[PDB]
Amino acid sequence: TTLHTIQLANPTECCTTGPLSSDESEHYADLFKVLGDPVRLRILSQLAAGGCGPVSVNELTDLMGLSQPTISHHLKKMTEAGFLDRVPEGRVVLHRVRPELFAELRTVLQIGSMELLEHHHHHH
Amino acid sequence: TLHTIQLANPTECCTLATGPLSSDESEHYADLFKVLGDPVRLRILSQLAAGGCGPVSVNELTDLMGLSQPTISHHLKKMTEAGFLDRVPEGRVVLHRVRPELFAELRTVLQIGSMELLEHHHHHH
Ligand SMILES: [As]
Ligand SMILES: [As]
């Protein structure tokens, strides 16, 4: 049996490896460039507000009030970078958020003491 | 142990990112990521954090990075205007220190389907 609790952990030490290398810096820069576009971030808001369910371009055009060609231009940039997966079988193509790169970028930005939850697993 | 967990309930999945992403501050967030989409800037952030986040002078960072003082000074100015850094005096010498606030905010905007927490297992007898 396990009793689960979620509690507050004490703050971490500020910035709990060394400085990023030339290539690792070039890579994350490239990713931040992709999210550096207000349209792209707005796209992301709407994927997020739908619970990260898959969506079609016509659904995103309805959610955003921008044209299909606009939303497509930006979905390709986002898929190419790796923030979204394209599920192309069928009559209507879906796009799905991928969590992986968002987590890597969170790590890059772990500057300062963090306030985290702690999940205690009480096995008994 | 630190653990990135998947947030498989759609209501929980993006529960901390949805609001700031949806807000009229979203264009600001995107300007911040644009500021961050420069490699030299990211490395400056790296050198600062690799020093425990103490305030550092431009002279010290030009020595650490091998880049010229006009280069680093340009980057520092853009990062300070963005709010990532601010300036703190040491007598008449100007130091730069990272500000944790915006970064914590950016972490929340990027909490898309997963999050970091600490896992602790306990046994009982
Ligand atoms: As989500
Ligand atoms: As630090």
Cα-trace Rg, chain A: 19
Closest by CA to B51, choosing from A12, A22, A15, is: A15
B13 Cβ below 6 A of ligand 1: yes
Is the Cβ–Cβ distance between B73 and B58 less than 8 Å?
Answer: yes
Instruction: Indicate whether B14 belongs to any domain.
Output: yes
Local structure of A52: helix, strand or coil:
coil
d(Cα B59, Cα B47) in Å, to the nearest integer? 13
> Using CB atoms, which residue from B41, B52, B106 is nearest to A14?
B52
Is the Cβ–Cβ distance between A114 and B2 less than 8 Å?
Answer: no
**In sequence order, what DSSP letters do the residues of A26-60 get, joined into one string?**
HHHHHHHHHHTSHHHHHHHHHHHHTTS--B-HHHH
Instruction: Indicate whether B125 belongs to any domain.
Output: no
> How many CB atoms sit inside 10 A of residue B30's CB?
21
Q: Do A110 and B107 touch (CB under 8 A)?
A: yes
Local structure of B8: helix, strand or coil:
coil
d(Cα A48, Cα B10) in Å, to the nearest integer? 9
d(Cα A101, Cα A82) in Å, to the nearest integer? 7
* Chain A residues close to B14, C-beta within 8 Å: 48-49, 51-52
B73 pairs with which residues across the strands?
none
Which residue type is seen at B68?
S
Residue range(s) defining the domain that contains residue A72: 2-123
Is the Cβ–Cβ distance between B120 and A119 less than 8 Å?
Answer: yes
CATH number of the domain residue B98 falls in = 1.10.10.10
Mutation target to probe the A interface, by most A beta carbons within 10 A, among B16, B26, B33, B119 is: B33
- As given in the structure block, the two tokens for residue A61 are 């055009």
Q: Do B30 and A36 touch (CB under 8 A)?
A: yes
> Nearest ligand to the C-alpha of residue A113?
2
> How many CB atoms sit inside 10 A of residue B18's CB?
21
Is the Cβ–Cβ distance between B112 and B4 less than 8 Å?
Answer: no
Q: How far is the first Cα of chain A from the last one, in angstroms, to the nearest whole number?
A: 5
Number of domains chain B is built from: 1
- As given in the structure block, the two tokens for residue A64 are 């955003």
Which burial class, exposed, middle or buried, applies to B14 when counting CB atoms under 10 A from its CB (0-12, 13-18, 19+)?
buried
Which burial class, exposed, middle or buried, applies to A17 when counting CB atoms under 10 A from its CB (0-12, 13-18, 19+)?
exposed
Torsions phi, psi of B91, nearest 5?
60, -130
